[PDB]
Structures are given as C-alpha cells and as structure tokens.
Design a protein around this ligand. Structure first.
Ligand SMILES: Cc1ccccc1[C@H](CC(=O)O)NC(=O)c1ncnc2[nH]ccc12
Length: 167
C-alpha cells in the first residue's frame, strides 16, 4: 500500500492521473520523482523548469555542480540527485528530444532507468516540448517499465486522450 491517490490503473504496474507533477510531488513526497531532463541538466522549461522552480532553483544549483564534475548525461541515460523539497530523490532521465533530431528508439533506453527504482512518480518521457507522440511514450512505458510507476499528465485534454486510446 502507498499514498498515491486518484490514479487510474492501466496495467499491473502502471498507473496514470491528470495532475501537475509539481503539486503531486509536494503532496506525496515520493521516494523518487522523475525529471524530464536534458543532457546538460539545464532545467529551463517543461516539466524540468517547473520542478526546478518549485525547488527555488536549488535543483539547478545542484545540477550545475553535477555537470561540472561529471560532464553531460547520455540521451537515454539518467542520474540520481536530491529530490529537495519534492521527494527523497530526483531521477533525472533524458528522453530523446525530437525537436533536436534524436533517435526515438532511445525512448526505450530512457524508460529502462525506471526499473532501478521500486516505485516512482513520473511524467511521460519525450512528451511535451520534447516533441514525441505522448501516446507512443505511454506504450513504451508500459512495455518497458516493470517497477511501479505513477504517471502524472498535466494536460487534462491529453490525459483523456491517453486513457481513451490505451490498448
Ligand atoms: C512531460 C512534459 C515534457 C515537457 C513539457 C511538458 C511536459 C508535460 C506534458 C503533460 O503532462 O501534459 N507538462 C508538464 O509537466 C506541466 N505542464 C504545465 N504546468 C506544469 N506544472 C508542473 C508540471 C507541468
């Protein structure tokens, strides 16, 4: 039993809700919140900008130190950093950005990072300003993630389409 509330159950291990991931994180304080990161951990917009803003820019400060030490992530890769006031940990995952020409096959690799964590709150990878088809992102999620994932979809209109079109 966990504290996630109001989710629709899609599969054995994948759940979904129309919710602002920022507000959802503040309420549940999950062990892991997933960020829709880029390889530079520059949290300017989209989910990343919103999560970072909610940390009062502490996420960005921590991220800049991480990059200065380690260099950029790989597309499809991830790193675990602090969850600040939102969660115990933030798993920064880099899905391919279609508006950068990056291989969509990398989306499966990106979701594989979720399997290292028993329970996660997460957005759809490569969705939103990353340019991929969110319906496809959901399919890859369900077919790749085996751990318990609670997906927050900000746009109500998109949430309804994702549910109504789910096979
Ligand atoms: C996954 C993604 C990647 C890039 C850009 C947007 C998104 C998603 C898309 C969706 O889930 O609809 N949007 C949001 O996460 C969002 N949108 C508006 N206000 C917000 N406040 C906290 C989060 C939040």
């Amino acid at each position: 039993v966990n504290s996630f509330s109001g989710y629709l159950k899609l599969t054995d291990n994948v759940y979904i809700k129309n919710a602002d991931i920022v507000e959802e994180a503040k309420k549940v304080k999950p062990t892991v919140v997933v960020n829709a990161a880029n390889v530079y951990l520059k949290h300017g917009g989209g989910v990343a900008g919103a999560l970072n803003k909610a940390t009062n820019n502490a996420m960005q400060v921590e991220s800049d130190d991480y990059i200065a030490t380690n260099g950029p992530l790989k597309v499809g890769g991830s790193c675990v950093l602090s969850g600040h006031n939102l969660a115990k940990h933030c798993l920064h995952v880099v899905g391919p950005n279609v508006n950068k020409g990056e291989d969509i096959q990398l989306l499966k690799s990106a979701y594989e990072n979720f399997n290292q964590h028993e329970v996660l709150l997460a957005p759809l990878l490569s969705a939103g300003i990353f340019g991929a088809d969110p319906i496809h992102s959901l399919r890859v999620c369900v077919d790749t993630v085996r751990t318990n994932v609670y997906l927050a979809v900000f746009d109500k209109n998109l949430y309804d389409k994702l549910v109504s079109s789910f096979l």
